[PDB]
Amino acid sequence: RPNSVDPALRRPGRFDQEVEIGIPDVDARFDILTKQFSRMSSDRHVLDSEAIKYIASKTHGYVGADLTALCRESVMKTIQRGLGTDANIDKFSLKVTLKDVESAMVDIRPSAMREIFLEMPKVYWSDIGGQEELKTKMKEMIQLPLEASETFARLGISAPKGVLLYGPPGCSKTLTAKALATESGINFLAVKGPEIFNKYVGESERAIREIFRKARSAAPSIIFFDEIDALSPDRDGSSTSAANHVLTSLLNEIDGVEELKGVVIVAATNRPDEIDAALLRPGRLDRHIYVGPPDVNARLEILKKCTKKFNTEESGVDLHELADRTEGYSGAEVVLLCQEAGLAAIMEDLDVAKVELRHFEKAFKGIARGITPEMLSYYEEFALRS
């Protein structure tokens, strides 16, 4: 670390030349992997160019030492699998394949020790149900920065890089971020809010600084937060100085004498009035999305998707009357209702190819929406006030 170096050495009269070797990118990692494979030659392995490219793309934050460790652990896993299964077969017969490498990179844990910006899984569009306005704003806020940099430079619009996601819990608040991680293809990173708190004091600040530096050096990406409602409230409720330090560090990173045009920061919150006034200021987190409960069409799509495994035609349900009746619920509520209906169907005679209407009615009667109109009124008041 150059910071720990004595500034007397760090002088233009002494050390005017500085050589910095940053973290390898996708191209450098691919080159290193190709060189390593050429080093051990094609006798001991069979790897294609697309396989190496896929491995390099998957290892977004790994380093050359990490790549060598991955290759070594894949070698041990292949050797032990061959010994266990093939009963001491020829070494060159099994050589190196891709499944052992995938298992090794899954089990090795990513390069960032105790990282908080995790790589959450992806899911395709037809598995996503929600309103079209949120999807339109989604396409808005992804299409503007990627292919409007020149327009912003010529027009002075720049990038606000601030979007606030407030809405009822459990209804597609993080679904938009998940679909964005799937569709965009850019390296996505997500933080669980309460995970930032640890027993040690000061570790959170340095972890945030190092992960922000990694995001800056890892090409323009998108940054998303799961539940900022655990760190934002410091004046409404009692909190330690660590939370205030985290809040002011985040404020300085977002708009404190620094600008991050490449990356876009989006924050998702459950309670709308627990965000601190300093954090909720013009210039940051400007965009606000209602992202309320799913409409009739989204609920119908979710019901059809859940009933897709079952036989909808001979079950007698039109997939629309049930959705109309189940109007006060949400996506998660509909999902759990379908799960309970399936459980009631399977508890009768084990495997079933359908779900009965009486079982669905019983499940609906048993379960409750769990959502109160006063919270919706509070959300509306917050929307009008902001």
Ligand X SMILES: Nc1ncnc2c1ncn2[C@@H]1O[C@H](COP(=O)(O)OP(=O)(O)O)[C@@H](O)[C@H]1O
| Residue closer to ligand ATP, measured from CB, 68 or 103 | 68
User: Which residue carries 């949120």 as its tokens?
Assistant: 134
Q: How far is the CB of 198 from ligand X (least distance, A)?
A: 21
Q: Please state the closest distance from residue 263 (CB atom) to ligand X, in A.
A: 17
Shortest distance (Å) from residue 102 CB to ligand X: 23
Span interacting with ligand ATP, options 64-72, 96-104, 138-146, 252-260, rule CB under 6 A: 64-72
Q: How far, in Å, CA of 381 to CA of 386, rounded?
A: 9
**Residue 23 DSSP SS3:** coil
Output the six-digit token pair for 113.
């020790």
CA dist 218 and 57 (Å) reads 12
351 Cα distance to chain centroid: 35
Q: Which of 36, 103, 174, 248 binds ligand X (CB under 6 A)?
A: 174
Select from ligand ATP, a copy of itself, ligand X, none the partner in contact with residue 296, using the beta carbon and a kind-dependent cut-off of 5 to 8 Å: none
Is 151 known to sit in a ligand binding site? no
Binding residues for a copy of itself, total number by CB under 8 A: 91
Min dist CB 84 to ligand ATP, Å, is: 25
The single residue among 23, 25, 64, 253 that binds ligand ATP, judged by CB under 6 A, is 64
| b/e code 262-295 from CB counts within 10 Å (16+ = b) | bbbbbbbbbbbebbbeebbeeebbeebbbbbbbe
**Of the two residues 64 and 110, which places its CB atom closer to ligand ATP in the complex?**
64
What's the CA gap between 322 and 316, in Å, rounded? 11
CB of 33 to ligand ATP, least distance (A): 11
Binding mask 14-53 for ligand ATP (x = CB under 6 A): ------------------x---------------------
**40-47: long-range contacts, CB 8 A cutoff, minimum separation 24:** 43/92, 44/92, 44/95, 44/96, 45/95, 45/96, 46/95, 46/96, 46/97, 47/96, 47/98
Does position 198 interact with a copy of itself (CB under 8 A)? The reply is yes
173 is in an annotated binding site: yes
- Structure tokens that stand for 385 in this block: 């006030």
Q: Which residues of 64-103 are buried (b: 16+ CB within 10 A; e: fewer)?
A: bebbeebbebbbebbeeebeeeeeeeeeeebebeeebbee
Element (H, E) at 29: helix 26-40
Residue 292 marked ligand-binding: no
**Contacted entry of ligand X, a copy of itself, ligand ATP, none for residue 80, CB cut-off 5 to 8 Å set by kind:** a copy of itself
169 part of the interface to ligand ATP, by CB under 6 A: no
State the minimum distance, in angstroms, from the CB of residue 287 to ligand X.
Answer: 17
d(CA 331, CA 320): 15
Please, which of residues 149-168 interact with a copy of itself by CB under 8 A? Answer: 151, 154-158, 160
Give contact residues for ligand X (rule: CB under 6 A): 127, 129, 169-170, 172-175, 227, 305, 332, 335
Q: Could you tell me which residues are annotated as the binding site for ATP?
A: 167-174
